[PDB]
Amino acid sequence: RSVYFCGSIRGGREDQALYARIVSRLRRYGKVLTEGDQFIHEQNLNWLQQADVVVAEVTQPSLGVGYELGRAVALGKPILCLFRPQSGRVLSAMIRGAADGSRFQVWDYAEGEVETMLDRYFEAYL
Amino acid sequence: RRSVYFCGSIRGGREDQALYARIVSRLRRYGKVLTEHVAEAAGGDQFIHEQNLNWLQQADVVVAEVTQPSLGVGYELGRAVALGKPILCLFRPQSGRVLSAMIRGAADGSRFQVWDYAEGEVETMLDRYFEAYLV
Ligand SMILES: O=P(O)(O)OC[C@H]1O[C@@H](n2cnc3c(NC4CCCC4)ncnc32)[C@H](O)[C@@H]1O
Ligand SMILES: O=P(O)(O)OC[C@H]1O[C@@H](n2cnc3c(NC4CCCC4)ncnc32)[C@H](O)[C@@H]1O
Numbered sequence: 001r002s003v004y005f006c007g008s009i010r011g012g013r014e015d016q017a018l019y020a021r022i023v024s025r026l027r028r029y030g031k032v033l034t035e036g037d038q039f040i041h042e043q044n045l046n047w048l049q050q051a052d053v054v055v056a057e058v059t060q061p062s063l064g065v066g067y068e069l070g071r072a073v074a075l076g077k078p079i080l081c082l083f084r085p086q087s088g089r090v091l092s093a094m095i096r097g098a099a100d101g102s103r104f105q106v107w108d109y110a111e112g113e114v115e116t117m118l119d120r121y122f123e124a125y126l
Numbered sequence: 127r128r129s130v131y132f133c134g135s136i137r138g139g140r141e142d143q144a145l146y147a148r149i150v151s152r153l154r155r156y157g158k159v160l161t162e163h164v165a166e167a168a169g170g171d172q173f174i175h176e177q178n179l180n181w182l183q184q185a186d187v188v189v190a191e192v193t194q195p196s197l198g199v200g201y202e203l204g205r206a207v208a209l210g211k212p213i214l215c216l217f218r219p220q221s222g223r224v225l226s227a228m229i230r231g232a233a234d235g236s237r238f239q240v241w242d243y244a245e246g247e248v249e250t251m252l253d254r255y256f257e258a259y260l261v
Contacts, residue, residue, distance in 0.1 A: 010226045011195040041231025061138040063192055063200035064228035070204020092137045094198035096168055097175030 001030030004051035004077070006069065011062030015084075018114060019057055022082070025115045026055060029122045044068065051077055053126065055118075058095050058106075059084040069095065073104060080121050081106045082114065102126075128157035128260065131185035131211075133203065134164040138196030145248065149191060149216075152249045156256045160185060178202070185211055187260060189252070192229055192240075193218045200229070207232065214255050215240040216248065 003026050007019040026032050033047040048054070054072045056065055058081045072079055079098075083091045085108050099106050105125065109117045130153045134146040147165035160181040182188070188206040190199055192215045206213055217225050219242050232238050236259060243251045 008195075010224050037227040037231030038233065039231070040227040044228065058197055061135070061195045061197050063195050063197075063203075063226040066197035066200020066202075067204040067226070067228045067232070068200075069197070070201040070206075071208060072204075074205060074208030090137055091168075092197040092201070093166075093171035093174040094178065094201045097171035097173070098201070099172060 002050055002052045003030040003032050004048050004054045004068075004072070005032055005034045006054065006056035006058075006065045008057075008060035008062035008065055010064065012060050015057060015060050018111060021114060022055070022057060022118065025118045029118075045071065048072055048077070049075060053077065054079045056081045058082065058091060059087055059089065061089075061092070066092070066095070069098070073098060076103070078102060078126065079104045080125075082117065083108050084111060086110065128186040129181075129184050130157045130159050131182050131188045131202070131206070132159055132161045132164050133188065133190035133192075133196075133199040135194035135196035135199055136164065137198065139194050142191060142194050146191060149189070149248055149252065152252045153189065156252075156260060157186065179205065182206055182211070183209065187211065188213045190215045191248075192216065192225060193221050193223075195223075195226070200226070203229065203232070207238065212236070212259070213238045216251060217242050218245055220245055 023032055023035050054077045096106055098104050150159050150162050150165040153159045188211045230240050233240050
């Protein structure tokens with residue numbers, strides 16, 4: 001399996017710690033592909049096109065993460081978004097509202113059980 | 127007349143709210159602005175997504191002010207690219223921040239354009255774009 005991971009970079013780097021934890025756990029389930037700007041865009045689109053599953057941490061607002069998710073939906077890749085409501089933020093209606101059965105899932109989580117949540121997704125929801 | 131889809135941060139932050147209202151007002155000169163809302167129960171967000179995607183499908187051109195990072199705006203732009211819609215992104219360097227590489231890196235001739243501009247000059251930039259590519 002090939003996994004494409006999305007997380008804020010230029011939107012802000014604050015959840016770096018958990019992105020690392022998420023990428024580490026994702027390795028158990030497949031090859032994590034994402035572990036000038038035109039070059040970056042083309043590189044990432046190529047990885048997105050070849051991915052079997054897309055996973056995004058969507059707590060920090062980010063144009064690039066949103067864009068990856070939009071491209072991924074249209075490519076028909078199954079998507080898991082992970083959101084932390086304890087931060088006090090409310091998730092974009094365009095992401096929450098993109099939920100679509102097995103094709104697009106948005107899961108709220110508490111930071112301490114992110115690994116448990118990923119296990120559950122790959123075991124029973126994919 | 128032509129239809130314009132306008133994108134700008136909401137849950138990403140409303141720092142540029144007044145600017146978005148200026149943009150929507152100026153865009154009305156060139157067509158019907160489908161998304162004036164840019165200028166609730168979570169269980170209603172799928173309704174919003176559906177409504178917005180229907181509008182995005184109808185749109186002749188997609189205009190985004192991308193200075194404020196936003197998942198929704200990014201998603202709108204990704205969906206728009208895949209639908210083949212012409213796109214203008216407007217960004218303010220004086221914000222101090224580096225625009226997402228996925229947005230700047232998406233530039234593609236006249237089809238996807240990213241325009242840096244100075245605070246105060248959004249109306250003249252909109253006019254120049256519409257005059258050149260839509261009128
Ligand atoms: O940069 P933001 O927050 O807009 O968008 C982040 C998302 O968009 C992709 N991305 C953005 N910039 C990237 C990038 N270049 C950055 C530019 C210098 C530090 C790295 N390299 C790889 N992927 C990138 C990532 O896969 C990430 O999931
Ligand atoms: O809320 P973020 O910043 O992720 O996304 C904003 C973008 O996504 C669309 N959008 C997001 N929330 C919307 C919304 N209502 C939400 C529910 C109450 C306020 C926000 N109504 C219409 N469009 C919305 C807008 O067209 C806008 O361009």
